[PDB]
Design a protein around this ligand. Structure first.
Ligand code: FES
Ligand code: FES
Ligand code: FES
Ligand code: FES
Ligand code: FES
Ligand SMILES: [Fe+2]
Ligand SMILES: [Fe+2]
Ligand SMILES: [Fe+2]
Ligand SMILES: [Fe+2]
Ligand SMILES: [Fe+2]
Lengths: 395, 405, 407, 409, 407
């Protein structure tokens, strides 16, 4: 049992919200690399922790991430001209480089100190693994960019599906680390037809790991069928792989009630599907399942496209593409799920571990501890699944 | 003159709102029987007094009405599977029967209950009881469904405003002489009198009024008397015509939304069928309303008001008499500000409603039994009427039953 | 900086807000003459300072601006029947003359005279319907504004209903620097200078202020200035530098705290000044093309104002068509009410700072009981005007003797 | 077995064609009474036998059917003004009354006797059983309007679903005399609406008459297969009418007016006792032919080839036979895919298609007979007494003997 | 120069038409495997040589291809139920098998009937059928662009509303790449040359012809040339020059006289060849974005194939996105059947000329009992491939030992 006050602490991320300041101590994904295109390419709107951002690739191929609004009079730089090593606002011709210096002011006698003085709120950025990463916490707190759990280096294929979801981050993550749901919700899609697991969790410093224990066809005398989802705090999940490639979900709070859900497949080129394969398989294709902004066309008004006939004709949910089955469940709990009223049981140990871990971490960090996960996962402490006796993937 | 405070009191239904608790002391329509369909059918979304509900018919053909959200993690049950005695949440495969019993849990070894209300099918509607369980009366018949051999045709519309203004419009004999002047024509009336003399008689369940107009002849010793019955909290028995009867009941969905049910009832040989009614009122689903019964007419489209029709001599230039009503209800805004109303002679019925329902909710707040419950409710023999009546006779005294044969 | 409270004070108009009361000390455009049409024509919804209004023209041809909501029980009179010298509500058939007298109630014995509906004195000038929306005993006689001297003038209006607060809109009209930047693909129109950083000079007046924007001209920048001069007329009019054929004015009426009716006027001699539809084509404010039937822009944040990226890499500055749509993309993205708290201004925003200083002054003064800015003997007239000329560096531009362009 | 020239004889109706003038020997439905509205009401467009017609109700309530094109310079009279006992073309203000008399020529001096001496094509008309009818034959062949087969008297409720279909009429009528199809196509819809038989293969039996033929379909009952027949009797009333087997409460009729060679007005009618017969909208709902939901304002269907008639594949995997909603819509899916004019030249017909074969024989025979100058089939001295029926009937009483009347009370 | 009649002979495929009979001597793609999917899947409508077809995979997984119209009264089998070993017509419940056999006729007693259906084969992502005389059906051999089952073959399908021949002409026309696709396959694809006007040579074979486009290489143009070799495999298949990672083929199938199914293929080693959706995305031929559910393009003459005039000013050649889409606009605007009568050809069109000659000759011969081009021991096999390579100025390209790309 949690309280309204506890729920706000965990979930809110905008402005001063403790969880926000915590999360900004980690390098965060801002948008997809496919969004910023070639040098001088079209500016792009993104949103993180309640802050509206421009992103764009300059003449030299450097990618900046900056406050969306012009330091002059707050017009949106997303309309700006991205040329000649800059991004120039349309209103008065102020030009910012990717580091947020004002290179020029078309309209102000630049033979005067306003050009040199004025810096524009801008952020360090890194391109890794198909995403633009930014560091949006305090300047000096900025760690070296250490390649994450799900991309050793870059001889790996990474295939991303992005979705902008209109609900809070914490419910979306919970759903990643929820072993039981796969046996009901995903049961027309997903070596065990076992609907009920026994849950066991072992906490670490990056987050936690948990194994879910199911009975295979028979041989459950000697056998446990184990599915180990790792939680990498604050917002990543390493989904138990398949025979071919690895699967991770990382969520980024755009604000209190919206989230950038990245669902990744990754591994050996020979074995990991290309972006458009992945997306079609997940039913998350721009132009078909998503609008040009990676928001979903499935929605509450059309009931996530549910087909009652497919349901009567055997299909469990009548919803195409497994994440969209998650999305229907997630969005219906509401913009921020009211955890106060939850009725949890043996199958939800994982969600409870996450609740505990994060509330502690934010409390800790808010009392001045180092932020959870910024300690002294990694590319070979990831997820697993095997029929392991009683008591990553590549080529 | 009302206060901003009394108007909150009269109007608000959500949460603890007094008028809320009061209303949940009657049986209430949740949705139509047509919506629920065959046993094992598609679950249905509904809303009442600011609660979200699933309605579904199970394999036995029993209808459940329950909180919309799963007792587990609050996922919408409206997506669940309705089959094999129960409704199953998609997420973790919890399954409820209609009574709220968590029959089975897919991922786990009278354990846990889910909020679920008693239900009752009657005259084309699924009723439920949302008051404290121990208060539930036995389902008497409403005053507009004698028995099962009565044809009951229902127009449902979901209107985006507060309930009270919608009812007030049912108990407002004057309006039909202006607003519906092109649709209820000297439908046909034996009077050109637009200004009816109003008279009221308070009762145990609400009240009756009369609207005494000058008939097309004999007005020396003759009134044309129209009588309407208000059945608290939110029901009006409209004067019939001489083939069938008319009734309106309004369920508040929340503080600014109402399920408006407009019924035609009587003897099947003489009462129009559902779709016929709908076409007449222009409330046909897929023509006038979307698949959830919300109008396609709205402020942006000006309820399709035809400015030429109006220069041609149609009065409102909006097709379908209730839509003409809707135009007026919705413009007063999502809760009418009765603080700023300048009422007159024709508003006597509305005034009695204003007073009675305030007394009732005040009374009820101080621990009185809710208006119209108990020994007090109306039934078949209380009714509306219309007839040419001699001025020597009191209308209070007129012995009218519902038109039939 | 400015403080949060100052911004609130300067911007909000709804209900009791001082700026609201102040602005209602001036006759206000409510809507266009062409909206109200013929005697006994369709009634028309309008909005000013957060009140909903009906405009209609009775059988006699008098135009009325009253409260939208029926005095009886509050239905909208916009649905009413406009005939026989009044507007009849559809609900119970109360009928109101333009003056707000209730002529008749179909539902009542006259045992009618009692009730008066909120109604405002009206005036028809320069293709607009005007109303005096403040305390009646303080209504001035209607004099001709600076941009419509008398009746032989052509006045061509683009009306646009912008979903943002009025002050950022006017700010955009008293800003000469932006024409070099935003409008560089458009006002590249007649301009005898390619200066981007004009020097700004102000002259406070009793009705507002004249500013001037001095650029180096194309020839003889040695001893000559290109002078463009704009007049701010409180509370929300701008007189824009004319071209050599007609004049150009902006008047903004706030419909509420976050919406403004925006009027962009071409005016001058009938045979030099474009007609209404030419003006809307040029500005891309054509109803049915660029605007819906209520004058709201079909361009919006979601469509990115139809900004065209290929057109931009092709040499077009903004990629947005219609010079004002270009303003519009800037204004609406600053937010419903612009946060001046966060501005970082330079020498170019001098006029803008004058505006904020003058108008904060005038509202503070007004809430003390000073006469409201630009009322009475102080009001600008025909003889105040904007202008563009090449002027000697040795002549004060304030002294330069300009008249509005005609012939 | 049939050839191309037989098919054109049977099917084509436009101006030239024999089948056309054979059909113009009967009164024909032109449009619903509902369409024509009030006196002075909006004019309506209709089309029969390749002729464009205006339909309007004049100031007196008299209903005219005329040619669509103004007799002046050929503008469409559908756009005209319907007032003051006439219909005035917008172009030059010529005004016609319901009998094609030119009342006025607003732009011609009445000093010119053109006014008195121009006549516009117009047909005799009749309002009956919810429909406007016109006689389109030569004037002097016009019969009296005898009350027809499926609207006995005036106190009968007649509930009409109209549907304009873009194919030739014959293949549609064929659809209505084909008792076999319902056990496949309407198999999820007439779940054994009720039928007392699980029997698909019905032994057919014909019997010529003077107006058409009565046929029956003998089916094994779920009860007393030993010595009991379940008769399902259709009547074909030439040219293009079918009295379908009425269910327990009301009678069902179909009548098809060819709009031209490749389009057909299809009227599907429920008729009987006011208390027993459903109303227009309830019927249209049932049938899924509601204007504004399943059809546009011209009674044209929204279901079409392009959208696969809203066939729902998931519904069909759920055990729904056709995956199409509304039984006529299932017929339509089939009738239209056969193409604008079905090529009977490739038909591989069988014992269950006897009905259709007899239909072909008759109309091919009666059209050549008429093409020769004999009275057209159905005309001469050849109403509601002969009807469809259905019963469990003993095995030694011939069904051509059965005394069954139209379903009333 | 060609005559109206020859053009008729070359292009028509429906019914009588000889070029119809000739083509129906080859195995023909009918539709994609993806379309029929699961056993008991949704029946698919197709169209070859002027006949409508039903395709469907049955309970066991066999794929039948048949005449669309039911043998009984000619309704569409496309609307039928595909279960339990058959496709059953909805009308009267006749049920066919993949082979044409009527297993059952619901409304007909129980106490030989056969429907037009063709031999089928699944390969390389396609359902093929043999739609010519049964006893002239050859064993199905691997086509030159999909050798074995360990190839990755990724197909884009687009139903195109013009005649097949102008579409194949477009595949064998090398000089077009340096004009139409100049913004797409630049000095994103890269070619080792800037030369637009190449010296061409043609070698006629039994199965069609090979030809070579000799561009001068960016460097060493004196003693080495850049050879790009296309292969025409009759009747309507082209093997396009590979890139360095994968091969590219185009097969066309006449749906009728004025509509072709166009299949544009990427093939090679799994580790080097794109998957379907990557292919489609790159060519902008994605179902739901560029094409409707039937693979018909959303680009068309009405919308000018989405020609972006601003991008053309920016320096994009065609302003049409997706290199095949640039092709489509040229092909379609030529008209449903291109009138070669009005063609004025030149050097660059040598291969096209060669096609017109070969195929006119092949069809004339065929009519008088010659064997159909590229059947029997004459057939192209996988040993045939297109290549690009920098080759010594005095090596005969005809003899170069080139194998299709793989590693
Ligand atoms: S607001 Fe961006 S340059 Fe002025
Ligand atoms: S929320 Fe319904 S079972 Fe989990
Ligand atoms: S509200 Fe207008 S007359 Fe009653
Ligand atoms: S064409 Fe009809 S009046 Fe002249
Ligand atoms: S038409 Fe195919 S079964 Fe009768
Ligand atoms: Fe999931
Ligand atoms: Fe009403
Ligand atoms: Fe501007
Ligand atoms: Fe049928
Ligand atoms: Fe090409």
């Amino acid at each position: 049992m949690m309280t309204h006050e506890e729920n706000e602490l965990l979930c809110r991320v905008e402005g001063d919200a403790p969880m926000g300041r915590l999360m900004r101590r980690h390098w965060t994904p801002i948008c997809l690399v496919e969004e910023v295109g070639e040098p001088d390419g079209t500016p792009v709107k993104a949103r993180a922790f309640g802050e509206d951002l421009v992103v764009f690739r300059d003449s030299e191929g450097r990618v900046g991430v900056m406050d969306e609004y012009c330091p002059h009079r707050r017009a949106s730089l997303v309309y700006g001209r991205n040329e000649e090593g800059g991004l120039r606002c349309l209103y008065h011709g102020w030009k910012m480089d990717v580091d947020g210096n004002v290179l020029e002011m078309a309209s102000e006698p630049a033979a005067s100190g306003m050009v040199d003085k004025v810096k524009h709120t801008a952020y360090p950025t890194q391109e890794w693994a198909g995403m633009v990463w930014a560091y949006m916490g305090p300047k000096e707190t900025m760690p070296e960019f250490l390649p994450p759990a799900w991309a050793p280096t870059a001889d790996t294929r990474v295939s991303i599906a992005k979705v902008l979801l209109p609900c809070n981050w914490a419910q979306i993550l919970e759903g990643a680390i929820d072993s039981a749901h796969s046996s009901s919700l995903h049961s027309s899609d997903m070596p065990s037809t076992d609907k009920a697991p026994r849950m066991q969790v072992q906490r670490t410093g990056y987050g936690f790991r948990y194994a879910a224990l199911r009975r295979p066809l028979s041989n459950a005398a000697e056998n446990d069928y184990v599915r180990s989802t790792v939680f990498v705090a604050p917002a990543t999940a390493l989904i138990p792989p398949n025979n071919l490639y690895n699967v991770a979900n990382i969520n980024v709070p755009m604000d209190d009630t919206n989230t950038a859900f990245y669902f990744i497949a990754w591994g050996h080129p020979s074995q990991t599907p290309e972006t458009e394969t992945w997306r079609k398989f997940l039913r998350q294709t721009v132009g078909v399942d998503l609008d040009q902004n990676y928001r979903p066309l499935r929605n509450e008004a059309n009931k996530f496209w549910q087909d009652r006939n497919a349901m009567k004709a055997g299909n469990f949910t009548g919803i195409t593409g497994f994440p969209n089955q998650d999305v229907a469940m997630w969005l219906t709990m509401g913009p921020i799920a009211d955890r106060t009223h939850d009725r949890l049981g043996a199958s939800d140990l994982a969600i409870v571990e996450f609740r505990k871990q994060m509330l502690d971490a934010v409390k800790a960090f808010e009392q001045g501890a180092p932020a959870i996960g910024t300690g002294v996962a990694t590319p070979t402490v990831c997820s697993f699944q095997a029929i392991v006796p009683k008591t990553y993937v590549w080529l």
